[PDB]
Amino acid sequence: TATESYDIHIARETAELFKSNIFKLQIDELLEQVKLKQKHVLKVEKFLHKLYDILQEIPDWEEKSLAEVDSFFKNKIVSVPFVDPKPIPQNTNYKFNYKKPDISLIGSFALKAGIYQPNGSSIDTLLTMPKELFEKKDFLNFRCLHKRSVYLAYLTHHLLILLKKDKLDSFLQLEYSYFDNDPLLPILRISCSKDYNFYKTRFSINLLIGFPYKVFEPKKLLPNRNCIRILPATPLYNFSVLSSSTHENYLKYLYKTKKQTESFVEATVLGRLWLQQRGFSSNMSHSGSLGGFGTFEFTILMAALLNGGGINSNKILLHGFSSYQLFKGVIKYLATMDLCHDGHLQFHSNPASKYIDEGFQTPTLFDKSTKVNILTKMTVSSYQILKEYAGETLRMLNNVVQDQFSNIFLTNISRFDNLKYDLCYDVQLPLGKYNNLETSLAATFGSMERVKFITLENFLAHKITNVARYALGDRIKYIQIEMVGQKSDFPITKRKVYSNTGGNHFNFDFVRVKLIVNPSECDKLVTKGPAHSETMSTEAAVFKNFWGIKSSLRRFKDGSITHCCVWSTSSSEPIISSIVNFALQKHVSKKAQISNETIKKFHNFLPLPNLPSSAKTSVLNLSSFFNLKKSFDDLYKIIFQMKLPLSVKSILPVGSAFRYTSLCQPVPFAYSDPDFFQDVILEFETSPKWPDEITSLEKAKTAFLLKIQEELSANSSTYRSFFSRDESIPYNLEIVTLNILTPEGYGFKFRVLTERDEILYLRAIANARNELKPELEATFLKFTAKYLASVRHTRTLENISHSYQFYSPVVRLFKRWLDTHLLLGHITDELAELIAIKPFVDPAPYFIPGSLENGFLKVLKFISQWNWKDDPLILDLVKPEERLTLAQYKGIQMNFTNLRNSDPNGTHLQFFVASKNDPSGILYSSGIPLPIATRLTALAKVAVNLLQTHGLNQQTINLLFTPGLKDYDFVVDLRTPIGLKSSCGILSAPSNFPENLNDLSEKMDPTYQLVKYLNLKYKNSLILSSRKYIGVNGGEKGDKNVITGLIKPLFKGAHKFRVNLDCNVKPVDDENVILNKEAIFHEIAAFGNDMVINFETD
Amino acid sequence: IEDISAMKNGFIVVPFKLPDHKALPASLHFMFAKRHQSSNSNESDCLFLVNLPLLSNIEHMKKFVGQLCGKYDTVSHVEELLYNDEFGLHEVDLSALTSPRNTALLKFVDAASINNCWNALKKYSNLHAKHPNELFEWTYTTPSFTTFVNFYKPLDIDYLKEDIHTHMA
């Protein structure tokens, strides 16, 4: 009913209003920003008018034999752009002629939907050859196309004459190209160099040669029909021929729809930009490009959805929809309504559009009026990717919290293949000439293939796609084959695009195979094939032939026996690399050379643990961490079950190993590793007997640890234990940890937490004089991070890591990178972890990372673009579709803006990083010196720039992990007397704990303590940085460290002598003093003494 | 600069020659000293010292005062170095709250000891100008490998047990 409909409509409007209104204003602004100025439209319309005159003056010539046209052109500059197969005298009875064309405009310019493009835009001018130039059999065997090419050539010759005459040839540029990069459809392109000069408008003019509507029986050109007699259907060929007859038809259809629908043009601009950012266009995708779906296809789809589109032909879009509603509705349809394997859309350009739930296994948008499949230019692989981008955009459009406009329209994700995709393989294919293919190509490219695929390039891209898809199975989600160096333009003096690059005579330099990985399956040992039975099924025969020597039979745990291939894991590369190499060399070309060295370099920058079969262990394998947890679990039981004066309530392990983030994988007995001792929080049942002052409280806690240690030593003597001071909570001098060494070779440090602790820190803040409150706040923050927030941080990251399998190795590599640049000492592990998770929990408009390279580069890219003065980082630490609500998100944003009100430049707090775990945004990022924050940003920019400039390769990757050590006041080289690489558990093996536990210390980093105490002494005046992981980053033996020093800007000039200056100073007169550099240098040299090898000063 | 023996606020300038290090290319460290005024009983006969050299301790300060006594044939006995918290570890009394950085006091055994030292320091402060080579070298305590790794060692269990057992009684 009308009232029912109205109520639903109002309910929906209200539900969508918040985002709808915001989006509209953003849309309005974008459209103004990209608006074509009327002066430019008018200026090209002036040239277009002259062009029409000139063209109208080209005289008809005469019916000519192929011999005659050949003679006509032989002596002239212009060549006929005959398509392959070019006509031979022996097989061409018909003849050729030119007569005056009907001129018309098509495309965006004709629909007045043009936008300002820095790169420029094309105006498509349609020149229809008269019907009498055609015989009704001309749709067959390239006849109409050869007629078309001569027609274009004759036109181009006479146009050149007439342009010379009007003096226009001095600023005009003429060249051949292919319409939509379709090699069957050469066109002429006119462009301007620096009154009819339209250079400043950024337009180019394409002269499209078309056929009259319905010159050939449309039913004879259906996708399932053959039109090249050699029979196999010729859908590619048929599309080129049939659509050459429908250009005006579609312009009329789109113009009519535009007139009916107020926001059509605006929605068209939104579609164009959305597709453009994602690397899509109308260009032919069959020859190794991402596309077949550009502005034209978007508008045709939108128009179809404005006249039905449901499974029962119901309207999807209404004529009164805002541009937001139109765009969103098209995206939603693309996301959810399958047009390839499971269905297709039928429409009538001349009646209601109907979704039909049978698929043709190729992208299909079928016009019942014209018999054209609008989506012919799209490969299956291009369509699958389009549908995923549509799904992601639909999710973004439904986000009622974080603003997605920039992600949707304003972010080019296509600039860098290594960010857009997870793995990219460069494939050299020196196939030689066409006559060489019998040996250079493993598959036959014969008569049937040429008829179906038209070009070798189409055949080759499809072959490589099909081979890689079958070989990789569920290891991947999406694939693109790219013909790199492919050209679309060629001189008017040439028949076609010619190439001799890449050791071949085809239109590409090499091929790039680009993958979106499936992390749950990508590095599995077994490629599963068909079931084994008595006689070979077709599927099993195919599998066996495809894999050859790699194929075997295997019994699975469930009792099944199937054909399979078994691969070897490697720490250095994904199994995918082996498979691509094997499959391409076997089934594409024996001459194929496959390389992907970038992924190996990133893999090899993760420290290799000294564990059995380490070099053969997947980067995705977490066994090291699982084995540590298993050891902990055994100890947990013993302590939890102990009879003590209070019962144990909780034992909560909170160390980096429990959330898979430790820089090095844990190795038994590797006690040199900074992360060897894993923190555990121990809580007893509540008790009113805990002391009400911090010294007595800590001693009471220690008394319980003593009882635990006593019981452990008595009845569980394969565990060893000792007590250690924790000096990291400033001014709490009595904290003791119980350090337990398990028989499996792992270390755990236990601290007690009571319900009294937080109360005492809060009381200390309340009691402190105003001047001191900041220091007590900082102490309380350190306490909170260690004892309170560590449990939720660890539980959250452990849990969601299962949905983000590449996060663990990515964050570990990120920490390694931070430590190589001496930053890790100032950046908490939690802050590093939360920055690194950004590309995983908030990937848009990219996909979630599916390789080590992809994730790591995304973290650096994020940092490079993060203006931490202006913007917070707010994370929804959840698995992919508990999320922050609108109110919660705005409340966190207000924490940031409040902070910036009194800290507008981020002098006190730079990186605001918040989540549901920490809405304050400052728990893990407080107390960082400003120069350290700026250096981190600077290094990320340096990294991104190095890669944009010099590309991603072995040399530039090495540079990412090399410190520059420039712009420092001083640099000190240290060497420890004993190398720690081995005892850190890194392969360049620890086997026991020392007899005397006092000797654990002999394999610990003395330079860590050195730098710790230097920072404590000189906190007021200097910033000192060093490596935290000497085993990892201290060279071949793990014995070299560096200290860099910065004098705080506060101490570069003189000051009044005051008793509380807290700086090593010298007098400059009897009233004023200045920092004394020479004395400080001698102090530092003396402090490190024999370990100080070199000391450089600015 | 050599002519600056005392600062305007009453602090005497007390320079030391810095020992050589293999890794560095005769520089001075400047400590500052003034007589301490305190109505507090345990802060009697003290010099307030600003900018003590790295890792200053009672042994180093006794050596210094002894060199002064030898040079100027005088008698001065040092009792204690007070409030030398070079690493800032005791800057806030968390214990009290839950119920002068880079400076210290050098305490002498009696009024005569400090007076003698103070007179000797006055003459010491004029050496920079008159006889710079007569300034005393400060030889830093130089922590060994063992000293740095000691920070990692277990707490002594028997000391700990005793400490905890007694405090809890």
CSV table of C-alpha atoms in Angstrom, one decimal, chain A residues 519-713:
chain,number,residue,atom,x,y,z
A,519,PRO,CA,46.2,-16.3,4.4
A,520,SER,CA,44.4,-19.3,5.9
A,521,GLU,CA,45.5,-21.4,3.0
A,522,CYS,CA,48.4,-19.7,1.2
A,523,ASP,CA,51.4,-21.6,2.7
A,524,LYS,CA,49.7,-25.0,3.4
A,525,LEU,CA,52.0,-28.0,2.6
A,526,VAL,CA,49.4,-29.8,0.5
A,527,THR,CA,47.8,-28.8,-2.8
A,528,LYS,CA,44.6,-31.0,-2.6
A,529,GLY,CA,43.4,-32.7,-5.7
A,530,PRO,CA,40.5,-35.1,-6.7
A,531,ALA,CA,39.7,-38.2,-4.7
A,532,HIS,CA,41.4,-41.4,-5.7
A,533,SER,CA,39.1,-44.1,-7.1
A,534,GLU,CA,39.4,-47.4,-9.1
A,535,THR,CA,39.4,-45.8,-12.6
A,536,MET,CA,40.6,-42.3,-13.1
A,537,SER,CA,37.9,-39.6,-13.2
A,538,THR,CA,38.3,-36.8,-15.8
A,539,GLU,CA,39.2,-34.4,-12.9
A,540,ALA,CA,42.0,-36.7,-11.6
A,541,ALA,CA,43.4,-37.2,-15.1
A,542,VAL,CA,43.5,-33.4,-15.5
A,543,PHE,CA,45.2,-33.0,-12.1
A,544,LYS,CA,47.8,-35.7,-12.9
A,545,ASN,CA,48.7,-34.2,-16.3
A,546,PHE,CA,48.8,-30.6,-14.9
A,547,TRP,CA,51.2,-31.5,-12.1
A,548,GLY,CA,53.3,-34.3,-13.7
A,549,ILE,CA,56.1,-35.3,-11.3
A,550,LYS,CA,54.6,-33.2,-8.5
A,551,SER,CA,51.4,-35.3,-8.3
A,552,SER,CA,51.2,-38.1,-5.8
A,553,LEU,CA,48.8,-39.9,-3.5
A,554,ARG,CA,48.5,-39.1,0.2
A,555,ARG,CA,46.4,-40.4,3.1
A,556,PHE,CA,44.8,-37.7,5.1
A,557,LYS,CA,44.0,-37.9,8.9
A,558,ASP,CA,40.3,-38.5,8.1
A,559,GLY,CA,41.2,-41.7,6.2
A,560,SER,CA,40.7,-40.2,2.7
A,561,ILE,CA,43.2,-40.9,-0.1
A,562,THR,CA,43.4,-38.2,-2.8
A,563,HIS,CA,45.7,-37.0,-5.5
A,564,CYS,CA,47.8,-34.1,-4.3
A,565,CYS,CA,51.0,-32.2,-4.5
A,566,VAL,CA,53.2,-31.7,-1.5
A,567,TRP,CA,55.4,-28.6,-1.3
A,568,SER,CA,58.2,-27.5,1.1
A,569,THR,CA,57.8,-24.4,3.3
A,570,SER,CA,60.7,-22.0,3.6
A,571,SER,CA,61.4,-19.0,5.9
A,572,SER,CA,62.5,-17.1,2.8
A,573,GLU,CA,59.6,-17.4,0.4
A,574,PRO,CA,56.0,-18.5,0.2
A,575,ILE,CA,55.1,-21.8,-1.4
A,576,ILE,CA,53.2,-19.6,-3.9
A,577,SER,CA,56.6,-18.6,-5.4
A,578,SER,CA,57.5,-22.2,-6.2
A,579,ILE,CA,54.1,-23.0,-7.7
A,580,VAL,CA,54.1,-19.9,-10.0
A,581,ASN,CA,57.6,-20.8,-11.3
A,582,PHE,CA,56.7,-24.5,-11.8
A,583,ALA,CA,53.3,-23.9,-13.4
A,584,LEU,CA,54.4,-21.1,-15.8
A,585,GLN,CA,57.5,-22.9,-17.1
A,586,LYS,CA,55.5,-26.2,-17.6
A,587,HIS,CA,52.3,-24.8,-19.1
A,588,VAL,CA,53.0,-21.3,-20.6
A,589,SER,CA,56.6,-21.3,-21.8
A,590,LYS,CA,59.8,-23.2,-21.1
A,591,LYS,CA,61.5,-19.8,-21.8
A,592,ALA,CA,59.6,-18.1,-18.9
A,593,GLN,CA,61.8,-16.5,-16.3
A,594,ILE,CA,59.9,-15.7,-13.0
A,595,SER,CA,61.3,-13.4,-10.4
A,596,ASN,CA,60.0,-12.1,-7.0
A,597,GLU,CA,63.1,-11.1,-5.0
A,598,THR,CA,61.4,-8.4,-3.0
A,599,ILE,CA,59.4,-10.8,-0.9
A,600,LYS,CA,62.5,-12.8,0.0
A,601,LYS,CA,64.4,-9.7,1.2
A,602,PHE,CA,61.6,-8.8,3.6
A,603,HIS,CA,61.4,-12.4,4.8
A,604,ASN,CA,65.1,-12.5,5.5
A,605,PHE,CA,65.0,-9.3,7.6
A,606,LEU,CA,62.9,-11.2,10.2
A,607,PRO,CA,65.5,-12.9,12.6
A,608,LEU,CA,65.6,-16.6,12.0
A,609,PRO,CA,65.2,-18.6,15.3
A,610,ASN,CA,67.7,-21.2,16.2
A,611,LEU,CA,65.1,-24.0,16.2
A,612,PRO,CA,65.0,-27.4,14.3
A,613,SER,CA,64.1,-26.9,10.6
A,614,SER,CA,64.0,-23.1,11.1
A,615,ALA,CA,64.9,-22.2,7.5
A,616,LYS,CA,62.2,-24.6,6.2
A,617,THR,CA,59.5,-23.0,8.5
A,618,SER,CA,56.7,-20.8,7.1
A,619,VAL,CA,56.6,-17.1,8.1
A,620,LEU,CA,53.0,-17.9,9.2
A,621,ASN,CA,54.1,-20.7,11.6
A,622,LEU,CA,53.6,-19.8,15.3
A,623,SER,CA,54.9,-23.1,16.8
A,624,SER,CA,57.7,-21.2,18.7
A,625,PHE,CA,55.0,-19.1,20.5
A,626,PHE,CA,52.7,-22.1,21.0
A,627,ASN,CA,55.5,-24.1,22.6
A,628,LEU,CA,56.2,-21.3,25.1
A,629,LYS,CA,52.5,-21.2,25.9
A,630,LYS,CA,52.4,-25.0,26.5
A,631,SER,CA,55.3,-24.6,29.0
A,632,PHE,CA,53.5,-21.8,30.7
A,633,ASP,CA,50.3,-23.9,30.9
A,634,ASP,CA,52.1,-26.6,32.9
A,635,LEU,CA,53.4,-24.0,35.4
A,636,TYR,CA,50.1,-22.3,35.6
A,637,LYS,CA,48.4,-25.5,36.9
A,638,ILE,CA,51.1,-26.0,39.7
A,639,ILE,CA,50.8,-22.4,41.0
A,640,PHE,CA,47.0,-22.3,40.7
A,641,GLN,CA,46.6,-25.5,42.7
A,642,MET,CA,49.0,-24.4,45.5
A,643,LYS,CA,47.6,-24.2,49.1
A,644,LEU,CA,48.6,-20.7,50.2
A,645,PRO,CA,47.3,-18.2,52.9
A,646,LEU,CA,45.1,-16.7,50.2
A,647,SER,CA,43.8,-18.7,47.3
A,648,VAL,CA,45.1,-17.8,43.8
A,649,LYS,CA,42.4,-16.0,41.8
A,650,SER,CA,44.0,-15.2,38.5
A,651,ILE,CA,47.3,-15.9,36.7
A,652,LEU,CA,47.3,-13.8,33.6
A,653,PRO,CA,50.3,-14.0,31.2
A,654,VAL,CA,50.8,-10.6,29.5
A,655,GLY,CA,54.2,-10.8,27.8
A,656,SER,CA,54.7,-10.2,24.0
A,657,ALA,CA,54.9,-14.0,23.4
A,658,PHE,CA,51.3,-14.4,24.5
A,659,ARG,CA,50.2,-12.1,21.7
A,660,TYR,CA,52.7,-13.2,19.0
A,661,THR,CA,54.6,-9.8,18.9
A,662,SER,CA,58.1,-10.6,20.3
A,663,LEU,CA,60.7,-9.3,17.8
A,664,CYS,CA,62.5,-12.7,18.0
A,665,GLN,CA,60.6,-16.0,18.2
A,666,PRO,CA,61.1,-17.5,21.6
A,667,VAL,CA,63.9,-20.1,21.8
A,668,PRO,CA,64.5,-22.5,24.7
A,669,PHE,CA,67.3,-21.2,27.0
A,670,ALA,CA,67.9,-18.1,24.8
A,671,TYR,CA,68.2,-15.9,27.9
A,672,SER,CA,70.1,-13.1,26.2
A,673,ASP,CA,66.9,-12.1,24.4
A,674,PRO,CA,65.4,-8.9,25.8
A,675,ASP,CA,62.0,-10.6,25.7
A,676,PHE,CA,63.2,-13.8,27.4
A,677,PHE,CA,61.3,-13.2,30.7
A,678,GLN,CA,57.6,-13.1,30.0
A,679,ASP,CA,55.4,-11.0,32.3
A,680,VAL,CA,52.6,-12.6,34.3
A,681,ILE,CA,50.1,-10.9,36.6
A,682,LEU,CA,49.2,-12.9,39.7
A,683,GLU,CA,46.0,-12.0,41.6
A,684,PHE,CA,44.8,-13.5,44.9
A,685,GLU,CA,41.3,-13.5,46.3
A,686,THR,CA,40.4,-10.2,47.8
A,687,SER,CA,41.6,-9.5,51.4
A,688,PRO,CA,41.2,-6.5,53.8
A,689,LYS,CA,44.6,-7.4,55.3
A,690,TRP,CA,46.8,-5.9,52.5
A,691,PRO,CA,48.8,-2.9,53.9
A,692,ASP,CA,47.6,0.7,53.1
A,693,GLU,CA,50.9,2.2,52.1
A,694,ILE,CA,53.0,1.2,49.1
A,695,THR,CA,56.3,0.0,50.8
A,696,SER,CA,54.4,-2.4,53.1
A,697,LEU,CA,52.1,-3.4,50.3
A,698,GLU,CA,55.0,-4.4,48.0
A,699,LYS,CA,56.7,-6.3,50.9
A,700,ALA,CA,53.5,-8.2,51.7
A,701,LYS,CA,53.2,-9.2,48.0
A,702,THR,CA,56.8,-10.4,48.1
A,703,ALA,CA,56.0,-12.5,51.1
A,704,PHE,CA,53.4,-14.4,49.0
A,705,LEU,CA,55.9,-14.8,46.2
A,706,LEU,CA,58.4,-16.3,48.8
A,707,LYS,CA,55.7,-18.8,49.8
A,708,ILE,CA,55.2,-19.8,46.1
A,709,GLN,CA,58.9,-20.0,45.4
A,710,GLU,CA,59.4,-22.2,48.6
A,711,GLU,CA,56.6,-24.6,47.5
A,712,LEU,CA,58.0,-24.7,43.9
A,713,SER,CA,61.5,-25.4,45.0
